[PDB]
């Protein structure tokens, strides 16, 4: 069976503004098997109440998922996603940029 | 303006770990509108979207009946796959189908399909004529002459030019406020300094419905064919999308350059500068 | 609506 690395964006629901609640999104996507590990983080530490979608795939056969949670930028705060999946040895990890 | 309804149903077998995941998830166009799930608590078809909540029960007792057969027959697919192939036991494996009918706005059925993949590639599939398959190496053909004998592309044919159009429109007619609504993108440029008296521009667009898009910067009057990074269209999660796209240009050049949205809910394509 | 699918 041939492994398919992940893509991953990180990226806001809406425009960051500091200070606002916002939501960030993790979307993860083409990859094979379909299991996967996704944490985010917010400095360096998983999230606990992460929402994620369930097992779908696109219709070149590879799978995605896109997760999310709450959030709340601020200038000094970093956040991040951390992608666990067989077709790397070591987890991936995205930060996510307020310009991207 | 064409519409499809599409099923994308995934086995995936975990020896030792229980019997295989099954998962089936309709789409009308590319919105998800009923998900069965093996793994549920009770697993059962479901809507996923306010607009299906309005069927007849009768119809949640059909199609979760057919997706526990759909599951069961899936887990002896599984098995035959590894026996076709002479594959070792105790791995994961993943068998995964597609099936739908693509409709033009005359009614016409433009493309039915049938096509499974198993671990991720292409296994077998119907042909565009609805009555020949194509298989992918020496395991699918024995799919395939199992199939040509047992009359398989017949019924594939018969319920793709009829329940599967029939059906299409019913979801269309409940759900027509919400699948064919149009939120137009909401653009606007940023501004960013590089290193070496670069700026990069990026052109976003924001909050539209439906996801193509297309976004592009021009100079003068042409457009920017490469130098310009663009990502994919991504969810937002509340049921639109973003999109953005940038050039790095030299510092005090911006205002030569524009960006162009173009999106089927703007009378006309939307033009932005810096 | 879904239908059945053939064994492979």
Known sequence: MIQKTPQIQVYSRHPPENGKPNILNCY???????????????????????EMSDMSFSKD??????????????????????????????????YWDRDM | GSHSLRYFVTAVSRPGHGKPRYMEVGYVDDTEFVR???DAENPRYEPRTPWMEQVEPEYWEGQTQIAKGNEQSSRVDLRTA?????????????????????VGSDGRLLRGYQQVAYDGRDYIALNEDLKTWTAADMAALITKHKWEQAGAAERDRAYLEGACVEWLRRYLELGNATLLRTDSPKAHVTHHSRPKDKVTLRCWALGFYPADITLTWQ???????????????RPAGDGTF??????????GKEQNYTCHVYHEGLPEPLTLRW | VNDIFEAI
């Open chain 1, 28 to 50: 993860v996507t083409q990859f094979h098997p379909p299991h996967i590990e996704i944490q985010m983080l917010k400095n360096g530490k998983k999230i606990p109440k992460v």
């Open chain 1, 61 to 94: 056969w590879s799978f995605y998922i896109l997760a999310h949670t709450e959030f709340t930028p601020t200038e000094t705060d970093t956040y991040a996603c951390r992608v666990k999946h067989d077709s790397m040895a070591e987890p991936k990890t995205v």
């Open chain 2, 36 to 38: 069965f799930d093996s």
């Open chain 2, 82 to 102: 590894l026996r076709y192939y002479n594959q070792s036991a105790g791995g994961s494996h993943t068998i995964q189908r597609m099936r739908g009918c693509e």
């Open chain 2, 219 to 233: 100079l003068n009057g042409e457009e920017l064919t490469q130098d310009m990074e663009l990502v994919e269209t």
């Open chain 2, 242 to 251: 973003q999109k953005w796209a940038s050039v790095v240009v030299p510092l």
